Design a protein around this nucleic acid. Structure first.
Ligand SMILES: [Mg+2]
Ligand SMILES: [Mg+2]
Ligand SMILES: [Mg+2]
Ligand SMILES: [Mg+2]
Ligand SMILES: [Mg+2]
Ligand SMILES: [Mg+2]
Ligand SMILES: [Mg+2]
Ligand SMILES: [Mg+2]
Ligand SMILES: [Mg+2]
Ligand SMILES: [Mg+2]
Ligand SMILES: [Mg+2]
Ligand SMILES: [Mg+2]
Ligand SMILES: [Mg+2]
Ligand SMILES: [Mg+2]
Ligand SMILES: [Mg+2]
Ligand SMILES: [Mg+2]
Ligand SMILES: [Mg+2]
Ligand SMILES: [Mg+2]
Ligand SMILES: [Mg+2]
Ligand SMILES: [Mg+2]
Ligand SMILES: [Mg+2]
Ligand SMILES: [Mg+2]
Ligand SMILES: [Mg+2]
Lengths: 206, 262, 145, 143
RNA sequence: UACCUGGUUGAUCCUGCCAGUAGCAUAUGCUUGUCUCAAAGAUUAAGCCAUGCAUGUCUAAGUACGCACGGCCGGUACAGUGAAACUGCGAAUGGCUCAUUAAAUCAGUUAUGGUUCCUUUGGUCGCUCGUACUUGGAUAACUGUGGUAAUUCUAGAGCUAAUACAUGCCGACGGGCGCUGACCCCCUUCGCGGGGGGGAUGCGUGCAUUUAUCAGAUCAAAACCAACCCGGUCAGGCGGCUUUGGUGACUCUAGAUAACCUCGGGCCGAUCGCACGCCCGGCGGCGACGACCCAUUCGAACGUCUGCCCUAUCAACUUUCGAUGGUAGUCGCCGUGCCUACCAUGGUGACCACGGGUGACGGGGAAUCAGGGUUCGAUUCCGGAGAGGGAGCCUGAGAAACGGCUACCACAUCCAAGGAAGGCAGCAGGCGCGCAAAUUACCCACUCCCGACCCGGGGAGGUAGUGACGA
RNA sequence: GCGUUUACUUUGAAAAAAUUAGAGUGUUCAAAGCAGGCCGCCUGGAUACCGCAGCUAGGAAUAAUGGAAUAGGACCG
RNA sequence: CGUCGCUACUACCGAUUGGAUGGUUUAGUGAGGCCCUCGGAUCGGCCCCGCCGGGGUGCCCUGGCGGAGCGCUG
């Protein structure tokens, strides 16, 4: 197939390496994966040494960690916005690394609505039309109320996540590549990268 | 090539087998095992050229297949099994337990021991692998992995293992003042005390060895095998005990040899 | 390998075409249906013969098997018979009885040696606290220098 | 000044996002008796190929040379000299071999013709297989 | 043994060559009684090839209703032998030749902390927690009809086995840990208190794998306001305390938390044979095997430093056709322009770059020699390249393999004219080209290799035949 | 566990076998070969050599290259 | 010492886009294999409809039989 040798190109000074062998099998290169956001579809591939590598053609779900309070969560994906290599690997969706993803990820309300003692949004004055978030907030006890008192005074979210629990952002860009490892596990960021990336989502403007 | 080699030519064989030139083309390939290729000795030579208990290659096949030889605790029937340094060859039919120790010249001579003594062997450690969720291992030079070693025994030490349980009894920490067995190089089969070691980070360290007769030479550390504490060794030795007579002294030991016997 | 085959649609397919009958025949045609040729052999397998010949969980298969009288030329025919496929458990007990006792042995070997290493550190811990309380008790004496 | 690039540059090993009331800086030693420079720890430069603040070890051989070209980015060219010896004629002859060496930005006072001491590492690029450990000054001329 | 002789001239001293002389290795001529060793289609044509051969395998131990055969104690199913199918095992070694290749191959030298490794040796094999007295359905051999000019060509019907193909129990078993926290106890103040002590419930509870975080594995130093668990309790009154190993150097082996785990799936025996007794359904020793991961072994693979033949009638080269670097990625066993996307304009050279030749395979070494050196190394040992020429890929630990497959070009066979099949630079032997180089013989006994393995195989190899290379 | 250098020289490790040079042996001698010699015994199968570079370790004649003179001088507080 | 004169010899320049061979080499097409997207021949199978057996507690599974969504899915 396609090679990864060195001999098929010039020296340091313009000369030509003349070839002294044919293409050996240990100099292999496969075609690219170029995965998408769809259903789940994974092919297994035999490799050198009898082992197995796992591709991922069509992928939907992920596993994204919140690096502050030691939590992570299996999480749904919708969107692709900013790639650091290709302007065109957004137009055609592809999940590779250091591609900020903004991947609606359940818009911080499958995650954030896990026992955090607060609402957000609901343009103020507005309520929830069912009474099920008020149940968690109107149940009193002896000393476990003091337990929520301490896990309430040392806990304030930043304003940038305070305004963005509608669609669900990620500075994440899963640090593992999906075309080699299978799954897709990333990590939400906070602070001074959100400014750099959103600054790259200021000058996009087509 | 495309795979591993399997044959072996008579000329490219190591020197300390003392095979001749005429009798054939090939030399018996040592099987894959614990010891290195150029550092072992096959049973088919030890039983066909060194001890001469049998002549033909089929009769060697007709020996170890009868469940006779019990190497260091467990019978192997491979007629070309690589047996190397610190192996207790035990024959049950005549009881002649053998130990393979280096001669004063660079080769392996036949050294007999007693069955009372054929109970333990001395092994040089190589590394300490700490198996987490748990305890450290050891790796000796013959690849005898052991569990629960010690919080004392360190990298380049020597221990005195047991045969039928594979467990330690005693050990010697490497200090200047022990014995020394030079396993490799231009001093292959010498014994002396240790007087100095020099550190070379990145590179490999060296150790000066003083013979009992004053002759102080040098040797890198990867050929060192401590056997005893102080002056006292812990095992029996072959005859000579590491003389390395001069080349003209062999005149004297060869001339007044017969003259002093007959 | 490349070969040469023919299509799957019969157009000019001379050369016999093998005509299987997967439907009931109602009347009498001479060559086909004269004698029900039996099976050359019968079963062997054990759940296939247990359940197939009218039998439950708690009964015995050591006789309900095809006997096949032969014709030799100087002796009496003999019942050639097989013995296969997980007969219930005559002595295959014995290997499970050993398999579940070597698990008791390798657990014994990992139970004897853990607490033994706990004692060998138990010895060297009286020294592990002794050396700190002896040497630093002398170090304050050295610092009072 | 910093981060003139399309991606975001940072060291990967440190978490910089807990409740912030400067970031702690990563640096290691090298062995063989080489002191880290003063500018590295205090410095805000970032690199993945520097032997002080990156994922590269130092192994093998240690050489020397002299700097002669700096037009490229983050690499400089040194010029080794030696003398081959014919034994037929009982004389010598001159040769010179050159190489491309990755330059950590922690060194600043480097002019042309400066004696350098390089170190072998893993291959970094097509022709760069060495890192700069220390750079001296030539024969005076401070003015 | 650091050595010379004839020849210009009518005669002499010269620079200078020619011819003699002796080793060496190819051919050839003449002559050839005996004995031990011993080269052999490399130089032109890596140009083509009829025949016959050159790689298969079973033990007391996977599966034998192979009568082809043959136990007799049967009446509870199997004596030992013994084609075929599969499963594993190999077929990737060994041989043969030198057409390509001029910092490339190679020798010496160092690295893997930048990675994979069938088998062997040794480890590990409850760690992970909620029909099993062994489950289920098909396909060879066989029988039974065949098509086909022809081939190691193959269909259709019926049987039927598995260490194959797939499912999925029982277990030790009580528990603790981290969390959710029904609720539970106690003091005090009138309390809204801060001071304390018990606990159901749900989840979960290695390793492999992927993310993120914590300290560790820090060195000699102090004067004080809100806290209050221990000891002074003298009256606010003044002293304190607990701990994995290394390496020259780790983002290393480590420990603990939140979860993640592929239906083209990860681990947890749904194996057989020798004895084999013990105890009222119950207990050991030996083995053959088989898989996960850590060591080890034979290694393989990418790189470091230095080291080569003739030519300037080759003096400037490379670079949007990746040339030299920076960033993020893709692939791949891992490190890198190896390759895409974006920026910069650089890199080698009279210390001989670039381009061209070679009747160039490289090195260990051989012949002559005072000391220096010249010339030869196709050829039995190590290491690489290649099987007419060039590209592509399967199975498999490992091959871009050719005594394995898919196509083109050139050379080429049998045909009923519908079609089929091939590769000697494997041993012998012919054609050819040449000044130029041997038997279409015998055998597994020796040395050794393969396999399920004491037991079957091997034109590898050995012994003979030719043989005035030579000694 | 550093002592801010090369060039040069000496030592020390490391360097595939065969070959060659070389001891031993009486294949009836010899070229070879690594065996064999005494009434179950005794051995042998050695050594030396191995440039050019890299690592170690001492040497400081010769041969190169360095400081203070717009004094930003080198210590000591 | 040279011209001319007979014989013999080797290369050299040269005609017809004088000429051809073979090896290294650019722009247009481009068999064949390998990933991808679909394709669904097929054998199915359970369930989903329907019958008798039996055991079970009219229905539930267990062994032949009438039929169907192309239901589920390999
Ligand atoms: Mg191979
Ligand atoms: Mg010379
Ligand atoms: Mg004359
Ligand atoms: Mg004669
Ligand atoms: Mg010849
Ligand atoms: Mg092969
Ligand atoms: Mg050639
Ligand atoms: Mg060539
Ligand atoms: Mg050529
Ligand atoms: Mg070669
Ligand atoms: Mg000379
Ligand atoms: Mg000459
Ligand atoms: Mg080879
Ligand atoms: Mg191919
Ligand atoms: Mg190939
Ligand atoms: Mg063939
Ligand atoms: Mg051909
Ligand atoms: Mg050839
Ligand atoms: Mg055989
Ligand atoms: Mg052969
Ligand atoms: Mg003859
Ligand atoms: Mg060598
Ligand atoms: Mg001078």
């Amino acid at each position: 197939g396609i090679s990864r040798d060195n001999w098929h190109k010039r020296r340091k000074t313009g000369g030509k390496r003349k070839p002294y062998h044919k293409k050996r099998k240990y100099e292999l290169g496969r075609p690219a994966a170029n995965t998408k956001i769809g259903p789940r579809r994974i092919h297994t591939v035999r490799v050198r040494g009898g082992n197995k590598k796992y591709r991922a053609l069509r992928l939907d779900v992920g596993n994204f960690s919140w690096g502050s309070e030691c939590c992570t969560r299996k999480t749904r994906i919708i969107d692709v916005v900013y790639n650091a290599s290709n302007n065109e690997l957004v137009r055609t969706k592809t999940l590779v690394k250091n591609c900020i993803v903004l991947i609606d990820s359940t818009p911080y309300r499958q995650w954030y609505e896990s026992h955090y003692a607060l609402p957000l949004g609901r343009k103020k004055g507005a309520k929830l039309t069912p009474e099920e978030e008020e149940i968690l907030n109107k149940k009193r006890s002896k000393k476990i109320q003091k337990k929520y008192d301490e896990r309430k005074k040392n806990a304030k979210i930043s304003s940038l996540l305070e305004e963005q629990f509608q669609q669900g952002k990620l500075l994440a860009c899963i640090a593992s590549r999906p075309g080699q490892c299978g799954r897709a596990d990333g990590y939400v960021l906070e602070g001074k990268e959100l400014e750099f990336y959103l600054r790259k989502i200021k000058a996009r403007k087509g | 090539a495309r795979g591993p080699k399997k044959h072996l030519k008579r000329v490219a064989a190591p020197k300390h087998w003392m095979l001749d030139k005429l009798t054939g083309v090939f030399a018996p390939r040592p099987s894959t095992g614990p010891h290195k290729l150029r550092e072992c000795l096959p049973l088919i030579i030890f039983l066909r050229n060194r001890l001469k208990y049998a002549l033909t290659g089929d009769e060697v096949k007709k020996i170890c297949m009868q469940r006779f030889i019990k190497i260091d605790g467990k019978v192997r029937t491979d007629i070309t099994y690589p047996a190397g340094f610190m192996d207790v060859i035990s024959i049950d039919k005549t009881g002649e337990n053998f130990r393979l120790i280096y001669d004063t010249k660079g080769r392996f001579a036949v050294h007999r021991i007693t069955p009372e003594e054929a109970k333990y062997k001395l092994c040089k450690v190589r590394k300490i692998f700490v198996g987490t969720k748990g305890i450290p291992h050891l790796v000796t030079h013959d690849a005898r992995t052991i569990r629960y070693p010690d919080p004392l025994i360190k990298v380049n030490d020597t221990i005195q293992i047991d045969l039928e349980t594979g467990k330690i009894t005693d050990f010697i920490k490497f200090d200047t003042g022990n014995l020394c067995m030079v396993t490799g190089g231009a001093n292959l089969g010498r014994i002396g005390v240790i007087t100095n070691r020099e550190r070379h980070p990145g590179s490999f360290d060296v150790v000066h060895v003083k013979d009992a007769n004053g002759n102080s030479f040098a040797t890198r550390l990867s050929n060192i095998f401590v056997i005893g504490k102080g002056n006292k060794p812990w095992i029996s030795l072959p005859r000579g005990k590491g003389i390395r007579l001069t080349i003209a002294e062999e005149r004297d030991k060869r001339l007044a040899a017969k003259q002093s016997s007959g | 390998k490349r070969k040469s085959v023919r299509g799957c649609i019969v157009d000019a397919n001379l050369s016999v075409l093998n005509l299987v009958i997967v439907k009931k025949g109602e009347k009498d045609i001479p060559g086909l249906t004269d004698t029900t040729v039996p099976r050359r052999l019968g079963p062997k397998r054990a759940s296939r013969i247990r359940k197939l010949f009218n039998l439950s969980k708690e009964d015995d298969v050591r006789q309900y098997v095809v006997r096949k009288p032969l014709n030799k030329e100087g002796k009496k025919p003999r019942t050639k018979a097989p013995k296969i496929q997980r007969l219930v458990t005559p002595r295959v007990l014995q290997h499970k009885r050993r398999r579940i006792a070597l698990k008791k042995q390798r657990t014994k070997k990992n139970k004897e040696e853990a607490a033994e290493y706990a004692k060998l550190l138990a010895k060297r811990m009286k020294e592990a606290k002794e050396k700190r309380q002896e040497q630093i008790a002398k170090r304050r004496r050295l610092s009072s220098l | 000044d910093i981060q003139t690039e399309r991606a975001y540059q940072k060291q990967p090993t440190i978490f910089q996002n807990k409740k912030r009331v400067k970031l702690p800086r990563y640096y290691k030693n090298i062995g063989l008796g080489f002191k880290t420079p003063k500018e590295a720890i205090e410095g805000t430069y970032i690199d993945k190929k520097c032997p002080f603040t990156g994922n590269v070890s130092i192994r093998g051989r240690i050489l020397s040379g002299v700097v002669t070209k700096m037009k490229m980015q983050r690499t400089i060219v040194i010029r080794r000299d030696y003398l081959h010896y014919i034994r037929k004629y009982n004389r010598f002859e001159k040769r010179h071999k050159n190489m491309s060496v990755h330059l950590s930005p922690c060194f600043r006072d480097v002019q042309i013709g400066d004696i350098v001491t390089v170190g072998e590492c893993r291959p970094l690029s097509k022709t760069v297989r060495f890192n700069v450990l220390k750079v001296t000054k030539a024969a005076g001329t401070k003015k």
